[model samples]
Target: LLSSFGTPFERVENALAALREGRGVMVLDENEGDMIFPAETMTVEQMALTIRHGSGIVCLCITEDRRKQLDLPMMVENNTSAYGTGFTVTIEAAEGVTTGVSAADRITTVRAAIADGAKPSDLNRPGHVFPLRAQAGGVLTRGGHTEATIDLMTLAGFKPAGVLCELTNDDGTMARAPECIEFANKHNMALVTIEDLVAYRQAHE
Candidate 1:
């Protein structure tokens, strides 16, 4: 069967396309920005740019079902961030590679996490790559990057998981909208706002 879909804004539409195409996109949430990619297709080159331009804390955003299926639990009982980002136990692929900090190793870990029927045994706790559980309602619930990432992936017909790394300025400050736009432009990557994603999902779904 053939089907077509799109959001109102060209920017959001392109961002969704980028996710399906396995490229990184800049996602803005108020003042901060996240460089996000489809976790399953993440490459070392994407991780490299993300680590350099991003805040270095690469996060994997997953749905609640995926979280449970993989046997990942909450890192804390209480919410830490204001947005209630459900941070889970950090993990690294149980087999292959060193340190788990390298871009290639991280790619491996992400692959393990999103692989079909992947289990907890495939990962080592307290390692690199943080996985955040996305809200069930997605952007309609928290409007954070975690939810935004999941929502975008769902709309793109991809596995409901994405890797998000915060964008940072040269002075180690959070990259705002203007800088984020420029960064996206410089990298030829798609850019979209959390508000836009929320609106698009509300309208389309």
Candidate 2:
């Protein structure tokens, strides 16, 4: 994979490997940072890490196809984000969960959401986990962190769904690139930019 993009291929590779190993990565898109992991193998500890260092608003990123399969309707006709991210009505596991805000409960909800035979009826709406419908073309179509998450999951050969949370500073502000890089270093997580992923996909695909 040859790329003129500034981020080294090794960085992107490391991020992919981390995701494949069920570890989190700090992804940057235009200085906005997100911590994401493959939802299929998401763990309570990882969720805790995200909540501790991130916005605590966990999101599940899935392709449009998966959204349709689950019969998830878009939350709005038009989106508020610049990338036009498609947010579906929120969901929580229909069974075996209490308030659904705990790390374990959220993990259960995420698992139920990504289960192969999952359907709309399998989850309770307006609940814990927020689902974002990724663009079909992923980073090729939109360079948003949501699309980047699903793209990285696909590249890592995981279920094409991911758990993501906006990285935040201790002061409750969104983390910038410098803060994200430091956090990644401290946590031994890879830090890669969405541009790196877009370039990799273009070269490989």
Candidate 3:
């Protein structure tokens, strides 16, 4: 589906047209400007990268740690988990700047970055277009939640990955629904709850 961020998505009919013949990602980066490109364009080698969603008409769900991993300055952390679970790391599209990437390409980079142990700069999902992490399913949310939540207090030395929307199922070794969690009670990994990050942001701000 064609999406124009920074504008009301579920508010009713807008102005964008969905493509029945071709699919692409429409992004409006703050520092870059407006741009639309095919998802396959990202498959090319030696492509440049944008650290985060960069604030634009579109929005991306990225975590605090993932933001730093890509050398992007801290944008904003979740004051509280979204849907009672999300460590709400949401970034709306800005007016300037550009990344030349769309949703599909962003997901490709997200999954690839997750595999390579880097930040993909997307959101918390694929199918939901929310976070990078997702339950096992289709190409919708395939990007694995390989990173942990950051507890800012012990922020240093840890490279947390993915947003905190749901408890991750790492190889089916963790707990089950209604009982499972993001990375809590896991390993050296951690969970940077929205409250924690937001508190930190507020304290510092």
Candidate 4:
């Protein structure tokens, strides 16, 4: 049902054939400009199939926070120094399945946190991690230190379905955190740890 753009002609042809069989398809056509396909070339069923399959391919780019609707939970954690003023926010997994905040903002805070000698875990939360189950289905970011986590996941052939954001709070508490849990709760996303989430999926699916 999901496909990337810039696919080969054979792939598109295969997809069109699949559509004729009545399967829904969503394609990400990065190269699609403003050209429109003619409906007269195909029968009514084919036209309807094309419309149903093609509408998912949107060219619009949305922010990380705003794009969380696609799938995945946005885990935002805050880190605040005892004296206050030393605040930094780091965004994790805000690129593909989840996105909203500008790339610039994501980079700035991360750099500032590193320059301030804050550990990656400290920038977010060390022990208390928040995890959620995806509704639409996809891989979630693996919890780890540094950029190594993502690299590890990719090397293992994993695509994340969710995002993690670092928050800033002088006092550690749910109130100070980025409300990632609240975000999940509002969206009716099931909350669980990395291990438990995997188990839950295995049991249900």
Candidate 5:
């Protein structure tokens, strides 16, 4: 099934295979918990009916990328930088379903934008802009944790601005550390985490 919780890792192989074969799976983590399923496993109506039948909070197993495209926060940061820089983190509020920038080119554009007091508007950049704020609002007119994560990624020499996917769990815990390492290893973007967020919180205190 698509649900990550309680489902055995053994099922992951089958799950991915099933997706490729045009089949979907739905499962539950615990008896009273949410129904964990692939996005394709059920229709929106099926999902709604399960709620009427008393299903718990439903968490769809959608890609981290999809979440960003839907105006979702990219692992909201409740703190500041590890090194005390004023940078914050946030996904560049993509204007629509499509992104205009990406990767190294996007990184350069973000660096330039931050230096020039501007925002990027093109392909190859998913608008993962950092280097713009510590507070009082920034990119796409958003603020807070977005700035924190963006700054850390920038300091690490990765494409902080125009980033699309974030590699953290729902509770703001980064499942991976140092996004670049994960990308280099060809691991999914979710595995590329920003460890500085956790460390900075502890160290700053």
Candidate 6:
């Protein structure tokens, strides 16, 4: 697994120790960036290549705590449980103020559409690409939703992940799908699949 952020050498040492002991613990660091190893072998070039391939990469931010506070749009958290891995999160865009299918189904359909040639330009929308500030305003909640969001987008053909949000028009009404896509293109802030982003990152890295 590849992650980002600068981790203490001690943490890397600990991870190496764990690997030596045959126990696999996620090496949480920001710099790890998009590399996977089958068991216990990895190389820098290989990792860079993986990042290029749009595979999952783990990134570390200052620390786990700070990372937790990042307000990732798709992060899911529960009040009673400590934040951990494998949670599902989602953002929603309402066309009619109605809750749609679960994140899983939405992503699945989206991926199918992508397979059928749906473009990233098609998926971009204001509501879908929320500002991190919106989350800070208590507009977003965390839970086991990240995993579901990831899965759903993956199904929908979103490469790395997909986000959900409520779309609104100039009068503060929900925007239709066509409008949403057009708005996204106009803003030039569309969401790309994990795979596409990874490819981009790798190419630039």
Runs in model 6 deviating more than 4 A are 1-148, 152-163, 191-205
lDDT of 1 by residue, 64-111 (tens): 898888888899888677667689989999988599999999988999
TM-score for each predicted model, relative to the true structure:
0.93, 0.93, 0.23, 0.20, 0.25, 0.20
Write down the RMSD of all candidates, one decimal each. 4.5, 2.8, 19.4, 19.1, 15.6, 20.0
Model 3: ten consecutive residues of lowest lDDT: 11-20
Worst 10 residues of 1 by lDDT: 1-10
Error of 6 at 68 (Å): 13
lDDT, candidate 4, residue 102? 35
Model 2, position 127: C-alpha lDDT score? 91
**What Cα-based lDDT does every candidate model obtain?**
0.85, 0.86, 0.27, 0.26, 0.30, 0.29
Q: What is the lDDT of candidate 1?
A: 0.85
Please identify which of the two predictions, 2 or 4, would achieve the higher lDDT against the true structure.
Answer: 2
**Model 3 clashing-pair count:** 35
Q: Taking the tens digit of each residue's C-alpha lDDT, what string does model 3 give over 1-205?
A: 1122222332111111211112112211101111122221222221122212212222223444445554443223533534232322333222122343554444454344333454434323222223332222211222222121222211322222322222223443323422222212221122222222333434544
- By summed lDDT, the worst window of 10 consecutive residues in model 5 runs over 27-36
Q: What TM-score quantifies how close candidate 2 is to the native fold?
A: 0.93
Given candidate 3, what's the lDDT at residue 174?
Answer: 26
Query: Compared to the true structure, candidate 4 yields what TM-score?
Result: 0.20
Instruction: List runs of model 4 lying over 4 Å from the truth.
Output: 1-163, 166-180, 186-190, 200-205
Candidate 5 C-alpha lDDT tens digits along 21-133: 43322221101111222222233343333333322122222223333333334333554546343332333423332342333323333333433233334212234433223
Tens digits of per-residue lDDT for model 2 on 1-205? 1223225677789898888777789888736889999998889999889878888889999888888887888999777877576789898999879999999899999999899998878898889889999987988998888899988898899989999999988987788778888887788778888888888889988
